[model samples]
Target: GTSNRDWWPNQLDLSILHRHSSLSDPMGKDFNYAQAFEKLDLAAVKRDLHALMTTSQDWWPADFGHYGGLFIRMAWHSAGTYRTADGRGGAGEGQQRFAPLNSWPDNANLDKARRLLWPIKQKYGRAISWADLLILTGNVALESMGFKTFGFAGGRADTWEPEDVYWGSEKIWLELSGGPNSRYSGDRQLENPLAAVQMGLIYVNPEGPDGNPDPVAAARDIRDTFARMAMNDEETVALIAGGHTFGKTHGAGPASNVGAEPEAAGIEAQGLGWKSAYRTGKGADAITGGLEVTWTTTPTQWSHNFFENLFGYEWELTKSPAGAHQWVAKGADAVIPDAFDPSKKHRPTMLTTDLSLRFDPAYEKISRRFHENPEQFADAFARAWFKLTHRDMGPRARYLGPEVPAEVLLWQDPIPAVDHPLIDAADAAELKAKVLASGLTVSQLVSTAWAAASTFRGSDKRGGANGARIRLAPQKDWEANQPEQLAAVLETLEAIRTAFNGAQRGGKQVSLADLIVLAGCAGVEQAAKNAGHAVTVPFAPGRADASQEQTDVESMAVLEPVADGFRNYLKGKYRVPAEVLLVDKAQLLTLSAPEMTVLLGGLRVLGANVGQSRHGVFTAREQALTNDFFVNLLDMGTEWKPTAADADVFEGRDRATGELKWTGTRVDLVFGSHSQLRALAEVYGSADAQEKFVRDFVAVWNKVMNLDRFDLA
Candidate 1:
């Protein structure tokens, strides 16, 4: 019977085209593998990014604050809904691309920032995901303003579906006004942020109209909002302080009438619903009165000036001309001159929330520490920013490209570049030519390199190129190690290393071993471009190769017994422990469950596996690197059957074709069997999710390729 419900199994049937008569492929027309990949030029895209971020000529020159500050707010507010436990509602899904999500009151005034990038988006075309651009734009703005490098990756696909999330509003107020622990009782239970978070209350209501919101209560709100995404107190402080270091709040008064323009409709009031001292059209500025003070003396630059001002100056509670409760310097000369701006001294802005940092002894101590050492504060902020952005994005969100050097991460600049060296066109072309000359196409090299590097132990070892060594190992033989097929790859690797010579990136010498990894990366990049996969693979060179003398039976033994997340490795001597297989046979390889799943599909499509483990009926299109692996695995028409000899082993057979299309390891079954893992698997398995699968798979593949490079900064 035909059911309207789009359950996992129903969607699975549509994925593999097994039930094509019943359902048409929803993504067939939108997905163009070769075209999308061909259009993506990661290097050129970055150059375009530099021009957009660094040159203020194209941006809306706001009188109150720099345009970069608003861009930061837009990126953070959009991505902050991430809930770590279930892996949902982050920038990865790009739900903000559509409305109700985009038009929500909480995301007010962000359209101004999005509109700025509309031209850029149109120029780049659909090949680029808006989700990636939003996050990357924020990072680029941060780096341009003298902040750390903060790693960025492209390939995140736009989720067109309406995202389900609770962005606290009037509805939350009705739901939690007095329903147990809603009020601040000056105790842990009532003021618990975790409790507030579960109830969908991000901001605590004001105790009464007489005074400002309770500082402790407001602090709880901060904790509640951040804690949902797995952030601790230090991270909370860093993110708030770092974010506040730039932007100013708007008010309805004349001096602060930031919403005069229709595009700036919601900027008149803070969307968080805090009680202010003045109402609209009832302040000293008569339309400009609201909270409007800068956090640092030098608000335009990225510095620990906020913390320095917080601890160094004495403060007094004062209302803005717009009637917002904020603390200001007690006396004109009481505040210290900014380190970056000695000519003019200004008082720091302390919102009730910022003042709350000092109200609590625990938070105050962290504040003092940041004030004393600016470098430590910057480091903590960078880490917190990464954590906040990566939340709810599955386990592999944090792993991409090469190790980011600390120097690159901590660079200061009027207009800074990302701290890693990118592969030049000449080098990329050279690597591609060398691989093709070996009688192998770019796709073959990519698949071969992935198969060798896919091993858990091989990826965990030094240089991260240990998989290359395993293939080149003398007098040693392992079942998983296909020495014969990899022989050409090994020879090509040596030739590329010799031909290109040594290179330098981020102040370190790049070795032959590093070149080996880069060659594989370059090959994948070239192949992906040729195939039309719109993804950016960040490349950095620093890995060192082990000498032939260092390679021996004892040292090479660790690289043996490779465990991959894709398969169960049959139940014989080489089989992985069944219990550990589904959990994280790939964790040893430093891959997340979602990453492993994405890579599993990629490998099957690329024909990178050692034997007949591929799970799809489309054997002819193995070189495409599409989402067929997921499509076939979730196909409703397919049924799992146990092997006659070994019940533990299973094969996926297409009912319509009556052909055993795929054999899977125990780990492969986990994507369907495990509840939490299945949520993501279902999304990637859908026909419309082809771009997403490609984006995620490429990012994960790059991570696996760089797993053993310890020298990365």
Candidate 2:
């Protein structure tokens, strides 16, 4: 049971690099899920999904003989895990099919939902991914139950169980109700990178903060949690109302009657969880979320009953049969038919968070707007649902399937489609020549290019050079980007871009976005030649410029590089080590260990550090892309020690004499200190690794430059 953390608690994790390796993936490298999906009959597949909703199964009977409610819950929870801070969790990877998420206390009994999807998956095979299936089935469920959907995009390729995702620091499950396991501060601030109140729950505690039934207090938690998922007041209100419209919360018996979660279940139970010992564990005795409530009379279909029931009657605090906090309509007019048995009528109920929509000022305004205007509510719900499901599923180019919407949305971080013909090789080569002569330093070119590309984190696939947002407000204003130097670099590139486009005879032209990256390629090529190696840095044009209006200033601001190891920059002192932050940033950029090492070596030699720092620049020849960083790192002549003032900054002194040889940050020291990274450093540090280092550096640099190029495929 010893985890990697227990073995070597401080070892910089490299598992993030192995996530995309070929050996662990059975689909193999050539299996293109997006292309393979185009051949599928989506209409027929949707029809089958529609049919599957109404048909009841013997093993696990559906509520009201319809699985729409269950499917909707499954889909919502799957996508609900996504947080804006890191963009880590979501339905994009079908991560709910794995451990931890599948066994979380809040995700109880969702195991049966995936089991229900087996038939569809088996029939269609690799053409459909479980990630896409999870979200699409929810879209289909809504449509079947009389809800108009915004659209469905099917490009969420499945990933194996991700061990690197830091869900939270909590040890157990769902215990953020003011205890030892609480992830809060005295100011009621939830932890960073975590959108949920509890460890297991997707959002806040349904009852209220600290397990108290305070609707007004719950409103604050709801706002905090939903906003992290990039939902506004209107969008948040719509999702809360729209989602509860179809599904009824389950808590028919004592919570203790339910069995263990999927991971801890007996061998005979297969992957099934929450095996209840209560009366007929399948249907009426289910215990999800440990609170019972039917928001509307028609749980099987979409209706305005949710709003009507909330506004039409006053609600009083109550508890479900499972002894959990809930609310019931005060008047006897609360006549909601039971899910399984239509013959019986029961009182309507709401969770504490649900009542906040009526009590809280901002949410109440949005709620009233939706209540008065049904069409507007439908539109809001459809769009918000689409955003919720597609929050982590990258750009427009990655979207696959016929249901893909034509209207562009801003949350997608959308780029303008290529209108003018792209610049050819001759056009690119000529532009490179002009750029090389543009009086820009090699460091400036490399720094500017890395700024654009490093903004792209592989986690959510947001932020990159395609939109040229580096020239826009938030990115241009970010201190990490070095705005003053960036402005100067942009001005030079603009002059070159203007002259070339003006003289073009035909529709062929260059975009500022394309030129910025191409200029960097020239810098790298020149640096390589200076190192006595002739190499061509790859460049692909067709990247279009995006309007300032298209950029989400607030969202883009969230991704500002606080600590980029490649640039040897740290915004401020933090609890986490600078070197650890470096690896995390590298993982977000999707670089392997060797690739990370190669980039560090090349960037240092090319003088690409923030503020042109000489901390890690071991070689005096700053213009050349040499392997001198690794070479100087492994030299036995120099010994390193923590400086007197800043512990992070180290002084490398000559072993023979007490003279200071060089200086470096922890990011520089890690390669020589760690066993695996030290080996890679030795490989590049060796006299034979000049050509290999240059080639590897260019390849990794190209990989990072194209991280957001979904259109390249």
Candidate 3:
């Protein structure tokens, strides 16, 4: 007899299915932030931002009596969370106001900065987003303080909470930063996706890595962390040196003197946190980052003092009042004015990581170059800062506002505009027919279309079929995209496009970008027709071809998929579960439970698996685009069991006999295994749901195809 819970339940339980509710969004489904943002009183809001930098608050005084430094760091902290690996984090959503991020040890007292901007928030109302406001405030801070910025691009709206990101798997804050932990094993303790060296930190530990004040290792850590955040060595040097040209670290007393972070603070204190008990804690004694050091002599202006102090002075280690390691200048002659007092001045000081710039040979060269040439430093900082702030904002088309840059940066994943006329209805019909008649299987077309569009990440709003980046390197060479299969398909599609373009006059022609998707549309319609349902997959034809020069292969390479459950492909046995990766990919695609299920089920029948892998194909009528995938998956006649060779691989055998009937990966069986997904599977698999499945799959497929079309929005 079996005991209760004897052989742990094979299926994932209900807990995993109970995901976050989108009900927190008060904005109606039709609310467009771009339209609202374009209507904003740009000059007035900017004037307000400029004035806010000088205005002082009694509750939280600005360092050196200027809010420029504060606002700049606040923006940096907001944007610095981005990593190129997963394209998550960054200032794209204005998520800094929420928990986890707000209460992180690294964010510290940034609560006061957001609070300072609240007056403007209320004044502007919904016209100005917190995301735009936060990023713009920093840009204004730089401009008002006499440092020219590259420009500003505003479109980011606010989110109710932090994105459901995997911020490393540490149980304790700074566990990895303490030198050894789970997130290690690749290029020191640093790992992919989670760019921060520690769980709570935005980047590397500022003091130094591994609890030691060693600049050599600190430089290595900085180089690694900054690279992950999409910066080269020169940009890293410029950012550290240029950003440090303003602001002072604070530590009037021990870390124990500060109160709770925003999330844990008492009700009486409201949302404010890190209240210092040091004398007159609101001003000179305020404890932020626990370094107790001011960088440049002029804390409010862009100057060469940061490099002057770093390279010119002989520095030695000293502990802050809070006992954190920092460096102070050797001579009393090189004195810097105190942040609060007029007559009082203190010795210039630096963080251990700051000294790393001086010691590392590569960083040393950049530091020397920038220190000798201020213009280079300023330009590098401006361009790098622009990338840092805007890296996660998807397309350049989504960017709006007066301060939007005229010059296009490659990392924006530039797609040239469609200068030529788009194909009209007749042209679409003819070209789409031509594409379907081209010798390509329905599987090849569907797979290629998916390979192009699924690269669109909701995290950064990057990647889509609109750019035709699939026809370029990196994307073309990506293993997940089926390089050789993609090559053959693209060859045929290019021929079709070339032939179509030549027959047209006055530059009125169809693009390869439009043709690729057109082929998929024709394939899906053909699949639907074969399944005995005549359905139309909608086609939109304004997409343009992108140039290789515009596509940053370095940046575009990060968009490669390591695991795609929709294609039933896994690069290797990853640490993260296959189902978890699947859920993450689905979430990033912004798909709901039914949409995710329906799309996968449709693709299975459409024979779109990588290399036409038979792992998830439950349909005998392959390429028919039916609900057979779900019906056969949920069939009681076939019993599922795991294989001994690979745990992820499963075999479906005849219920009464030992003969194998079919096979699947975890991504396939997961539909029937998970309770909620099983519910969705049952609906699609049912006899009455044939039409609904087709309709839902077509809707989702259209959505994925148009995912990056902010122009349409």
Candidate 4:
């Protein structure tokens, strides 16, 4: 709302302070997803949040022996909600404070911090249920670690401590040892004897009530009769098993009893199998929106590495030797017995091997048990020695609410945007000039670029090959040798516009050689686009040998010194990793002066279709051209050299700081924007406006590369 610089001080207040969506507070503005998310300072937040807790009390946090237990308890209760007619549930707010759940054994030590938050809940008049409180506690734990999207829904009843919520027979076998069951397609509950044998498909052959299965039966069965399915593969086994971190700690059944795990008789009576299939009569169907790990490469960028890992074989190392072979056998079953026989199968069996992994309902069932039923599994597995790897799940599974809602309730932090308000053309120009005249620094330039780019939010596909910022730099090792030159480029380019205005700045000096380097940078972007890839090309000014003309057909990569500084800044501050694709090709040919203008003109084509929101070559050029001195570099080594008088005529000083400065007098004459040229006619090309432009230029720099952090700035 505060677009005007002068009005900002008045507008800045508590209302403007953004509330992070991870915490529940009715007074905060409704959450928005667009806000700038600061890099999470997890270590610090963890320490601080934990420090507020009193450790010696007669509660669960004291009993758990560590803060991690408390963190887990908060997460579980956060998703507490009433089981529906269909047996699915939602997490409610503040319900944990008054319940059987508060004293639930799996949740024993988790409530220590709950009492501490009583004052805060009361002060805000917050109407939170126990289930919601538990998940909110989960948010507190994970937000400290910089993760997002643990879904939330608040609505539930609170109750005093009860006899149920304890681990019992069937729950123990399901959470711990794989036994006493048969299996069906997806999720189907069958009689106890059959479910046990089928569940053993991923563990071992089922044992009867007498525990009479041969000790090595599982190993022998997996080696000969069946093959492992992809889902049953080992790594898939481990990651899925990790999902049980919470499930094993609690039990959820009638007349509820408590036992760590399945004894032979318990397994025989209740039956052990995947609940999604086991709960057919109990309304246990795969909920549509459950999150699955699906074993990925990196969730950060949109790329094909994930697909490659899926189609080409990649193993997940499940630490359980017994669990490993069992899962592998299950995986083998997913393939046909005639897989190697072309005649028996419709196509070559090997051809059927490649497939994209499905995000399934099983993941949701796994998630529900993990977040809502950890105590049952924990009690069993804490003594089982090793867990069944197939049950491992991802972080998302642990944080998500019990029922997969029609839509996920993601936590979003909002960032404020200050739009340029409409004003009279002349007044607007004058105000902009004043902002510029204030001073020039790298920060202002970056902010202006952000302001310009933020106005355009369109489809990501809109930017063609031409939609990119291209910078050429040497490899990292080469750039390390010429840090001074890189520093010089940044410094010299900083104030050239203030030193010279329109009339004095124009000239034709840049030669063909300089244009080639810029072209090569642009070329790499083009090639990468054609190949349907994204890239970051790095090159240096003086390192001729370092710039190898190559093409990146594989992955994104980086070059150093020139581009490395920016890369380091983004990564160190943002925790973003930018892979650089190396380009080793011909020396990019430079163009003549007229040709150079034409090239820039061609690149500007993208701007015509793209509105203020688009970020491609146009914005990149807008950012690059803000450096008015580039025209000077183009002018040098041309038809003539500047005489002492010529230099004196161009040089100027800072009216505010009284420091002498270079007036790279040819900026507008060579590369001015159309609006800038019109402004030149109005001010008659005054030196003050140029100075203002330079001053305005410095407002947008990102301090990630500042002297305080790195040496780049």
Candidate 5:
């Protein structure tokens, strides 16, 4: 029997109709092999993502041997974003319409697919883009697998200029140390102000040392830095880092090597090094050489697991004479090596970085002033996004599109509060009571709520943000969309409601602790998807103890980043500064970026910890290393600042001693001393104690670092 409790039991059944769907069979059952091959060629170019994936490693290598699986992911996203401007067509209807994937940075390398897709576009006499090709191919891939095929829509408007594209996202900018307009490709040719902001290279100019800020940075760019500046939560950091777990090996470029030009550097990196080192020097050009490998040698494959090869699994690039240089000098730098911090700047020439090379005073002031406030930044981000993604659409840009309002896009107001969209204000009280009376522990309630909240963090409201000022249209029914799209949209709304209820509000019925619990629950549920029963459960309250179980131990990458964040907080806060003085509130906010950068680096250092084994099995060793690294992190000690009553003074401690010998306050509890950290690692490092050490370490990290506050009760 289908369960009403399921998120969309009806929708799940509907998906079955699309079984055996093919990208070429847009008309369904009228399968066209010729068109299918054309799609295959086009998609392979747009979605293939050769630079990153072409290595003989990763999850989906069967398609292109080594190109990237992210291309498929990109395809999925591209298809999902499709829509008919006239509301008539369905999925794949927008076939790479410049208005969608072409404007997104996530669909980074779609041009190569254009050449491949040329004949098809001409044959059908339909304007198709790399974006369309990518999504169509993704649907094909999924359909080829046993999965339900994705639904695509068309009717996206195309643009001629690059200004219409929004490749560097505000979210990426906030989390990273840059602004929304910051250029990602600072390598001269691809210079975009948006990329500059996202990449953290915004240059501020001052006029004549009066300290009047210069206009080097643009107003649009500077104001976009606030959204992520205030998010001091360590857990967010961890969650973000999980996305970066897969190691990256880059071809040498202007940024990576001692070169002045990006093209020249990239050519050398890919040609002289990648080809000669990674591939046989047999390839004619830099574009086609070497296999991409996060782990040259993985568990499934033995010869080219990048991780294992780097960890100690394989030797040399190859045994052949051409591969000898790579094989013999096989050190850590051979793969996923150090950060590329080029001494001289290599700025790109794209729209994203057009403003940086020249100087402007007013723009710099606006830019600096903007990063300190989230509301302001959010608004600027919307406008910049509107300009870039919509070819400077000005007033018509929507954050979630269509049903949403201009005010929401402008960040002039809070996300439209969906009142009773699901449950009303009157029901809030009853709902709270029912949930409370359920007697579920904080953890259980959160877990339940998270299942719903996970779907709705950021979404468009049914009614929209702007009122009739924009249009006097009737209320949107929102029920006519395809089942999959509807399901995702519905899921987001429910998820947002759950999150709002689960969030931490000082006087609200639901506490912050409750939200944390829900977040933990969400994390566990996420982990459970791949690895079964990896997380632990909450104890029966008022009891002396509870038994620990591994049934919920989900193998989630998100955990590592959160834990790393907590470590970064400790390291950052502990660093001694020579001076402390009162300044403007704005000054304090501006200073936070550099400090946050240091913290991120500190956390990354701990995250970089790896391990090895003598048995040439690099895959197992890398896995063990990752697991062991987490275990070792658990063993570290924690020292909180002592209570005010315990230490009468403040700010008078000796900087070097890390003690309270001075006139101020002292640390509260500092455990797992340096020796203890080393000892725990030693114990865990041993064969027999490895499992025990990992278990204990995880337990300790959860108990101590996972909590909201630093002060121990």
Candidate 6:
């Protein structure tokens, strides 16, 4: 195994090389190397992961089975398959993708996790690996559930095929050293070679009336199994306890099944491994861990609740028809619900092996400490998990970014902008630096400013809040301007203003309007460049600020639906019309057909959408500033479909999978339908023309940003 010191800090280096490798051949094609590599945004990847965990409801909510738990299990199982002596296991090759390893009974229902992550894998196939994604997802799940789990870095490569010699193979059988009474002495099931490894020898031979497992023998076996991968006692105890904090065990009916016969369909038979419950008989009547139950109060959140519950309460051994020993709450009065509820009765459940930890003196002390101080447990678990996941990897492992704590790596606040403004260059440079320093990322600043820019409508051609300046005005409590979505952006912009309040300029004071517009311009350029489309977004200073006295409630009203172009406002309501969703209110902003496409795509990638309406051309390619919107818009496989509103919007369904790949507006369809815009769309749609599309879009975006600045020639 690689030593601790060798692997941690250099994880960042691996991520960097991983990105470079992605550029070489993503999806088996020599993509635009420079552009593709530039678009390999780690921050963007983090955002997507964050959205999947917290924002999008992709996780299962039934029976305490959040995707977080499944993801944690998936990472553990993938890494756990490793054999220390042979060096064939570990997440190094993402071997979980293959036959026997993936199909193993021990890995039952883990396909749910892989399936959940399928879209992300497909979206970021080139820049990330399934192994990396598994580990990263687990880490993200930990952090999302409030555990400051170890930081993560990615660079795993998928294995080409199954291991040449699996545990059940004759070669592996000959290697077994244990005698007839040894835990490894059982008949070697060719298919379930690693079954004992996964079940752990300690559990397979439980003490007392169960399996007469000798504590001394069990401890030795446990040490041998864990030591093979170089894990100490703390790692073993913490991994088992921490892992139990998420998922529940299956009932006793079948090895692969979870619930009772009628409901207990094994994972494979269910087709998709989503939320399916199997009734495994009455919870109170049966033993052998009768019913599926969570180990923690906050099943979705990663707390030290497992240890808390385990040590805090008393337990009694019980048996099912299968005669397996499991624990339940001691007294008849101690019944609790399976999920956190008042009426649904469930036994306080536990595995026979988990009780072993309490019985053993050495493991009990560690459990006590974890129960006493959750933070200490979290810290130790983080370190152990890091070692566990990367056991077999060497320096050659690829990576995508630095290994930073997930909590610290806030996706909304990405790296500070790298560009220095050259026109008003000095002032622009200083102002941007100040904003970046004040907890605002260039993307956040850009998204906020663009929302302000989007509210500008025309034909007196200019009668909207001036460049988000209206947001600065005070509002009446009685009135409504959709403050729900507006508060976040407004607070960020206001914070920037407060940072520079009463501060000096080059012999002149910085105006509020100047800061806002400068933020708008710098944000646009920085966001576009970060998206891998380097473009000169026009920026010239001289816009002035307007105070509360200068603007009225009427003006703020015009900037409705939260004024970010994230959604639309109708009559007295500021919400997206369901029929016209994805189709922006561009007419409200007075943008042209092709122009709206770029703006909407730009907004989507910039993270401007409110309430997870992160759909459209730029949805999946969230950080790419290129014309993927137009490219996807014109993909030959897509056919423009109609909505209930009867507008022929471009809704592209994957030809093979028949899954809806994308959705777009009727205005976006104009690029392909209307003769004039068809040529323009065709140009942007071509893969080779991305560079040109970036250039054109930047010009159009600048025009949109500078709408109220009528003085610009």
Give the best candidate by TM-score: 2
Candidate 3 collision pairs: 394-461
Give the residue spans of candidate 5 off by over 4 A: 1-70, 73-110, 127-131, 139-151, 164-713
Against the true structure, what is each candidate's TM-score?
A: 0.46, 0.98, 0.96, 0.22, 0.24, 0.44
How much lDDT does candidate 6 score? Answer: 0.53
**Whole-model Cα lDDT per candidate?**
0.54, 0.88, 0.86, 0.26, 0.26, 0.53
Colliding pairs, model 2: none
Cα RMSDs, all models: 14.2, 1.4, 2.9, 24.8, 28.4, 23.7
Off-target runs (Cα >4 Å) in candidate 2 are 1-4, 177-181
lDDT, candidate 5, 1-713, per-residue tens: 66743854322121111222344233445533324443333433324433224433221122224222333334433333311111111122333433333323332223233333345455544334433444444434333322232133222322232212223444441233324533343432223213223321212111111112222333233322211211111211111111112222222221121122112235434311212222222211112111122322121121212212222322333222111112222334433322222232211111111122122343334433332343443344333322212221112222221223333322221222322223334334343444334443232332222222121101111111122110111111111112233233334333544666565344233222233333333333223222223544231111011111211112111111111121211112321221111011102112232222222222222221111111111122221212333232332231234346543223223345655331211110111122322343344435575335334433432332222121111
Total clashes in model 2, counting residue pairs 3 or more apart in sequence or in different chains: 0
The residue-level lDDT of candidate 5 at 110 comes to: 31
Kindly report which residue stretches of model 6 are placed more than 4 angstroms away from their true locations once superposed: 1-39, 54-61, 169-219, 252-293, 320-323, 332-337, 340-342, 396-399, 404-713
Error of 1 at 695 (Å): 30
By lDDT rank, best first, the candidates go 2, 3, 1, 6, 5, 4
Give the higher-TM-score candidate: 4 or 5.
5
What lDDT is reached at residue 582 by model 4? 6
Native-referenced Cα lDDT, model 4 = 0.26
Residue range 164-236, candidate 4, lDDT tens digits? 2212234232233334322322332222112122211222232211123222332232222111211223223
* Candidate 2 positional error at 303, Å: 0.5
